[PDB]
Design an enzyme around this catalytic site. Structure first.
Site, PDB file in Angstrom:
ATOM      1  CG  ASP A 276      -3.251  -5.189   3.611  1.00 19.23           C
ATOM      2  OD1 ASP A 276      -2.097  -4.723   3.753  1.00 19.23           O
ATOM      3  OD2 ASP A 276      -3.514  -6.205   2.962  1.00 19.23           O
TER       4      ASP A 276
ATOM      5  CG  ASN B  20      -1.130   2.462   1.361  1.00 12.08           C
ATOM      6  OD1 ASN B  20      -0.551   1.696   0.596  1.00 12.08           O
ATOM      7  ND2 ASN B  20      -0.917   2.436   2.678  1.00 12.08           N
TER       8      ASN B  20
ATOM      9  CG  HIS C  83      -0.475  -8.005   7.147  1.00 14.13           C
ATOM     10  ND1 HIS C  83       0.213  -6.928   7.667  1.00 14.13           N
ATOM     11  CD2 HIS C  83      -0.799  -7.690   5.876  1.00 14.13           C
ATOM     12  CE1 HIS C  83       0.307  -5.990   6.740  1.00 14.13           C
ATOM     13  NE2 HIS C  83      -0.328  -6.428   5.646  1.00 14.13           N
ATOM     14  CG  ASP C  84       1.880  -8.084   3.608  1.00 16.18           C
ATOM     15  OD1 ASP C  84       1.285  -9.072   3.105  1.00 16.18           O
ATOM     16  OD2 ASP C  84       1.479  -6.874   3.376  1.00 16.18           O
TER      17      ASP C  84
ATOM     18  CG  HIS D 153       4.027  -6.200   0.022  1.00 17.00           C
ATOM     19  ND1 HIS D 153       3.880  -6.117  -1.357  1.00 17.00           N
ATOM     20  CD2 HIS D 153       2.780  -6.126   0.546  1.00 17.00           C
ATOM     21  CE1 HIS D 153       2.592  -5.974  -1.644  1.00 17.00           C
ATOM     22  NE2 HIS D 153       1.891  -5.955  -0.487  1.00 17.00           N
TER      23      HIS D 153
ATOM     24  CG  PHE E  53      -6.417   0.417  -5.826  1.00 15.63           C
ATOM     25  CD1 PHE E  53      -6.707  -0.925  -5.654  1.00 15.63           C
ATOM     26  CD2 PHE E  53      -5.753   1.093  -4.809  1.00 15.63           C
ATOM     27  CE1 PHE E  53      -6.348  -1.585  -4.486  1.00 15.63           C
ATOM     28  CE2 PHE E  53      -5.373   0.430  -3.654  1.00 15.63           C
ATOM     29  CZ  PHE E  53      -5.669  -0.909  -3.498  1.00 15.63           C
TER      30      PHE E  53
ATOM     31  CD  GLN F 179      -2.827   4.266  -6.706  1.00 18.00           C
ATOM     32  OE1 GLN F 179      -3.595   4.246  -5.747  1.00 18.00           O
ATOM     33  NE2 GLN F 179      -1.907   3.336  -6.886  1.00 18.00           N
TER      34      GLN F 179
ATOM     35  CG  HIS G 285       2.586  -2.667   4.031  1.00 17.71           C
ATOM     36  ND1 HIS G 285       1.434  -1.943   3.801  1.00 17.71           N
ATOM     37  CD2 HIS G 285       2.231  -3.974   4.019  1.00 17.71           C
ATOM     38  CE1 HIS G 285       0.432  -2.784   3.620  1.00 17.71           C
ATOM     39  NE2 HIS G 285       0.892  -4.047   3.799  1.00 17.71           N
TER      40      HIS G 285
HETATM   41  C1  LIG Z   1      -0.830   2.683  -2.743  1.00 23.09           C
HETATM   42  O1  LIG Z   1      -1.549   2.006  -3.763  1.00 23.09           O
HETATM   43  C2  LIG Z   1      -1.761   0.657  -3.649  1.00 23.09           C
HETATM   44  C3  LIG Z   1      -1.557  -0.125  -2.519  1.00 23.09           C
HETATM   45  C4  LIG Z   1      -1.817  -1.494  -2.547  1.00 23.09           C
HETATM   46  C5  LIG Z   1      -2.298  -2.105  -3.711  1.00 23.09           C
HETATM   47  C6  LIG Z   1      -2.595  -3.542  -3.806  1.00 23.09           C
HETATM   48  N1  LIG Z   1      -3.042  -4.029  -4.922  1.00 23.09           N
HETATM   49  N2  LIG Z   1      -3.398  -5.336  -4.688  1.00 23.09           N
HETATM   50  C7  LIG Z   1      -4.155  -6.124  -5.713  1.00 23.09           C
HETATM   51  C8  LIG Z   1      -5.554  -5.552  -5.867  1.00 23.09           C
HETATM   52  C9  LIG Z   1      -3.398  -6.150  -7.029  1.00 23.09           C
HETATM   53  C10 LIG Z   1      -2.988  -5.790  -3.476  1.00 23.09           C
HETATM   54  O2  LIG Z   1      -3.043  -6.924  -3.063  1.00 23.09           O
HETATM   55  C11 LIG Z   1      -2.433  -4.595  -2.719  1.00 23.09           C
HETATM   56  C12 LIG Z   1      -3.307  -4.308  -1.493  1.00 23.09           C
HETATM   57  C13 LIG Z   1      -0.968  -4.841  -2.321  1.00 23.09           C
HETATM   58  C14 LIG Z   1      -2.506  -1.321  -4.846  1.00 23.09           C
HETATM   59  C15 LIG Z   1      -2.244   0.048  -4.829  1.00 23.09           C
HETATM   60  O3  LIG Z   1      -2.455   0.775  -5.979  1.00 23.09           O
HETATM   61  C16 LIG Z   1      -1.964   0.103  -7.172  1.00 23.09           C
HETATM   62  C17 LIG Z   1      -3.109  -0.595  -7.861  1.00 23.09           C
HETATM   63  C18 LIG Z   1      -2.699  -0.615  -9.312  1.00 23.09           C
HETATM   64  C19 LIG Z   1      -1.548   0.325  -9.481  1.00 23.09           C
HETATM   65  C20 LIG Z   1      -1.508   1.107  -8.205  1.00 23.09           C
HETATM   66 MG   LIG Z   2      -0.372  -9.397   2.040  1.00 19.80          MG
HETATM   67 ZN   LIG Z   3      -0.293  -5.870   3.485  1.00 21.59          ZN
END
Ligand SMILES: COc1ccc(C2=NN(C(C)C)C(=O)C2(C)C)cc1OC1CCCC1
Ligand SMILES: [Mg+2]
Ligand SMILES: [Zn+2]
EC number: 3.1.4.53
Length: 329
Positions: A236, A239, A118-119, A78, A290, A287, A82
């Site tokens: 956001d 990725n 935003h961050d 963050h 997610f 991942q 980003h």
């Molecule tokens: C590149 O991978 C990621 C980029 C951003 C995130 C985010 N997770 N969250 C919440 C849902 C916890 C968020 O606010 C953000 C958007 C910051 C999660 C990612 O992958 C991880 C999930 C679990 C392990 C790997």
């Molecule tokens: Mg944020």
């Molecule tokens: Zn962000």
């Protein structure tokens, strides 16, 4: 009065600014850790925002420099890189053929400014961590969207610094509309609002209308802001939709940040948050979870809204998902 050689290599990388898949880490290295300033400057010049909003270029640079300095260089995910990435991703989404001539210059400025702030001043821990530790930020914002309220307050407050008011020539009407839209967009980046945003985006796809061939009809503020909110939320959560060399760098950084929060939680004898325990970690499975539960449902719905403009991004997301699945041992 012509660029140094490092400034030339930076300028050549910035030719990719309109493409999904910009070498944003390389831009961070070449700019002396100024990715947000150089990418925002390039986008403002490209979209003619300095002329449209009568922004003095020295004011823009001073504010961007100040904003970028209030992202923490010691936070792995963050940070200013980003922010720069979400700005550039929002810029590409705003250029989607299905949205051509839909949004005003003020709405474009709102989406890009929202993305840039935003961050800002993110401490590298979650809202729940800030709430559970009785932190000052959680107390200031009554435990509700603590970080997102803080990002907005800092992004706006930094406008009062010496030569930093980039909105100094906007009318009061323009400033009130810009301010409301920026607040509505950044508050929508709180993941606790994801399910409601997605529900509303799905409703809009089911009732979608197109006018003058192809281009979305959005005739009320509720629909216009919902699309901008989902657009920046997509940026956001972009990725896993990027080429895998970029995605893996973002995954390394988010896992460093999460494991660091987990170490802070374990050393204080707090419950370790989901995916924050480096001793009990399944990065590949996480991942895939997610993508399956959050990123794919969102991007599949976005792809429907702007059909077929996002097919390549959805294809990349599905390929990256298969790659991570195939490495679960
Ligand atoms: C590149 O991978 C990621 C980029 C951003 C995130 C985010 N997770 N969250 C919440 C849902 C916890 C968020 O606010 C953000 C958007 C910051 C999660 C990612 O992958 C991880 C999930 C679990 C392990 C790997
Ligand atoms: Mg944020
Ligand atoms: Zn962000």
């Amino acid at each position: 009065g012509v660029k140094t050689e490092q400034e030339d290599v930076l300028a050549k990388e910035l030719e990719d600014v309109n493409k999904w898949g910009l070498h944003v880490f390389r831009i961070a290295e070449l700019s002396g850790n100024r990715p947000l300033t150089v990418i925002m400057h390039t986008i403002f010049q490209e979209r003619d925002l300095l002329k449209t909003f009568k922004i003095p270029v020295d004011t823009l640079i001073t504010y961007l420099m100040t904003l970028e300095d209030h992202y923490h260089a010691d936070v792995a995910y963050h940070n200013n890189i980003h922010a720069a990435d979400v700005v550039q991703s929002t810029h590409v989404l705003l250029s989607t053929p299905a949205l051509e001539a839909v949004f005003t210059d003020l709405e474009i400025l709102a989406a890009i400014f929202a993305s840039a702030i935003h961050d800002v001043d993110h401490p590298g821990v979650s809202n729940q961590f800030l709430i559970n530790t009785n932190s000052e930020l959680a107390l200031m914002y009554n435990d509700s969207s603590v970080l997102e309220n803080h990002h907005l307050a800092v992004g706006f407050k930094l406008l009062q610094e010496e030569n930093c008011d980039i909105f100094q020539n906007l009318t009061k009407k323009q400033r009130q509309s810009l301010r409301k839209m920026v607040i509505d967009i950044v508050l929508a980046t709180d993941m606790s609002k994801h399910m409601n945003l997605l529900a509303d985006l799905k409703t809009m796809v089911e009732t979608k209308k197109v006018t003058s061939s192809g281009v979305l009809l959005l005739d009320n503020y509720s629909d216009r802001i919902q699309v901008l909110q989902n657009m920046v939320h997509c940026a956001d959560l972009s990725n896993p939709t990027k080429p895998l060399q970029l995605y893996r760098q973002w995954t390394d950084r988010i896992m460093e940040e999460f494991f660091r929060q987990g170490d802070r939680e374990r050393e204080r004898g707090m419950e370790i948050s989901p995916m924050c325990d480096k001793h009990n970690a399944s990065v590949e499975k996480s991942q895939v979870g997610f993508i399956d539960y959050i990123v794919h449902p969102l991007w599949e719905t976005w792809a429907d809204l702007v059909h077929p403009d996002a097919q390549d991004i959805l294809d990349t997301l599905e390929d990256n998902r298969e790659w991570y699945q195939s490495t679960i041992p």
